[PDB]
Ligand binder design. Structure first.
Ligand SMILES: [C]OC(=O)C1=N[N]N([C]2O[C]([C][O])[C](O[C]3O[C]([C])[C]([O])[C]([O])[C]3[O])[C]([O])[C]2[N]C([C])=O)=[C]1
Ligand SMILES: [C]OC(=O)C1=N[N]N([C]2O[C]([C][O])[C](O[C]3O[C]([C])[C]([O])[C]([O])[C]3[O])[C]([O])[C]2[N]C([C])=O)=[C]1
Ligand SMILES: [C]OC(=O)C1=N[N]N([C]2O[C]([C][O])[C](O[C]3O[C]([C])[C]([O])[C]([O])[C]3[O])[C]([O])[C]2[N]C([C])=O)=[C]1
Ligand SMILES: C[C@@H]1O[C@@H](O)[C@@H](O)[C@H](O)[C@@H]1O
Ligand SMILES: [Ca+2]
Ligand SMILES: [Ca+2]
Ligand SMILES: [Ca+2]
Ligand SMILES: [Ca+2]
Ligand SMILES: [Ca+2]
Ligand SMILES: [Ca+2]
Ligand SMILES: [Ca+2]
Ligand SMILES: [Ca+2]
Lengths: 114, 114, 114, 114
């Protein structure tokens, strides 16, 4: 199944934050309406924050996370969770190798803000 | 029900990251085995990362998040989600007022690392 | 924090199914737009299905689950989880006593149907 | 990533319940420690509860859900969510065709029981 794709409420600000846990340099692209809206990159084996930004979901609300390492897309896993019918998390893990820890880039999207 | 309390695997590193979305200064305390192990404070209405840290869950695995604004405890919500039977997120929202957006401090705990 | 309240897309059919795990008889009420739409009753300590039904979320999309045991409101826990940006679960547990297993009535709402 | 595989508490009873939403007849197989422990089947476009059973997770706790329609494996999506650090849901969706509603067989595993 498709992973890393989320429909947010239209025209809504959201946070996006990426963490790295791998030998390899992670590039995380955040798409809004099928165009790149932000790109983060970095390398850490200690969960460093490699980027964080506030974006608008735009007219369609379609947000997609893609991760590439060493020139190839990582395999993604994702889900959305909503707490007390108010607080939204869109969560992404990714695997760049063979160990299947799925933490090589971890991406957290949260909304609403403010 | 109790919120903001999670049992992690023992002696395991985890990440903890706090975001703020309120006019009030947030104080986030992260307790491991009932003792404060990290503290973050700050004011943002735009999802600032008021702190991120790597901690060790220690012998007990017990991790608790508390949030307050100038000493008044915020009301918490929380849950844990596991992706592909491997990747863990422990999620906390908090409310410091009456609007019930539950984003006033947001805390994400993730493991494994590395 | 309020629990057991979910906003569904408007005018959408959804399933609601309840299970019991308690010596007490569980009564589960399901409200749509603040009006009772289904009621299930039963007793089991073996996870029996005490009711299942299909409802429509109507113009507001507001769905609420309440649980009581001999008229005493149970404390609730809840969350919503969306897989592949398509499949929705609204999940409720409830506690009628002191052991805090929160399984005394378990309610699963799922959509879309069909 | 692998989907539909969950590590449960060892030696512990859990509920497993399947719902159908497709023109195709669903077959759901539940494996405990790699051996078939339950099979459910039916055909509904209105969320029929085609099976529900209590199983024991056995010595290893490994539980796997597979879904097929007329002998062809469906694509699976899954996650586990934990409420108040104790109430667990392992969730599976599946797709037998091209519309990507992932509801064609829906499986919910819940524990603890009793
Ligand atoms: C006098 O005293 C004081 O200072 C005050 N008053 N009122 N207030 C309020 O509070 C609240 C709670 O905290 C707040 O809210 C917050 O923030 C906002 C922005 C949002 O975010 C929400 O959500 C939160 O909760 C408000 O703001 C305030 N107001 C004013 C006017 O300040 C305080
Ligand atoms: C006379 O009075 C009466 O009835 C009583 N007492 N006590 N009790 C109790 O309660 C409780 C609460 O509800 C119960 O718990 C329940 O169930 C069980 C089995 C389990 O499940 C739990 O979790 C729940 O919560 C109990 O059982 C009882 N006990 C007796 C002996 O009965 C009542
Ligand atoms: C002749 O051939 C046959 O058999 C067929 N064709 N087409 N089909 C289709 O398929 C599909 C897949 O499976 C189906 O889908 C299902 O169901 C529906 C109702 C819904 O639920 C969905 O989601 C699912 O997936 C369809 O139905 C069909 N169509 C017709 C018309 O049949 C088969
Ligand atoms: C240090 C290692 O780097 C890459 O091989 C990752 O895929 C592994 O998960 C691990 O983080
Ligand atoms: Ca890896
Ligand atoms: Ca890694
Ligand atoms: Ca607030
Ligand atoms: Ca706020
Ligand atoms: Ca109980
Ligand atoms: Ca019980
Ligand atoms: Ca389908
Ligand atoms: Ca279907």
């Amino acid at each position: 199944a498709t992973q890393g794709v989320f429909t947010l409420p239209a025209n809504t600000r959201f946070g996006v934050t990426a963490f790295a846990n791998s030998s390899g340099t992670q590039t995380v692209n955040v798409l809004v309406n099928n165009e790149t809206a932000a790109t983060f990159s970095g390398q850490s084996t200690n969960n460093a924050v490699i980027g964080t930004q506030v974006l608008n979901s735009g007219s369609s609300g379609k947000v997609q996370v893609q991760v590439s390492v060493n020139g190839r897309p990582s395999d993604l896993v994702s889900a959305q969770v909503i707490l007390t019918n108010e607080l939204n998390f869109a969560l992404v893990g990714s695997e760049d190798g063979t160990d299947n820890d799925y933490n090589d880039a971890v991406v957290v999207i949260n909304w609403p803000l403010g």
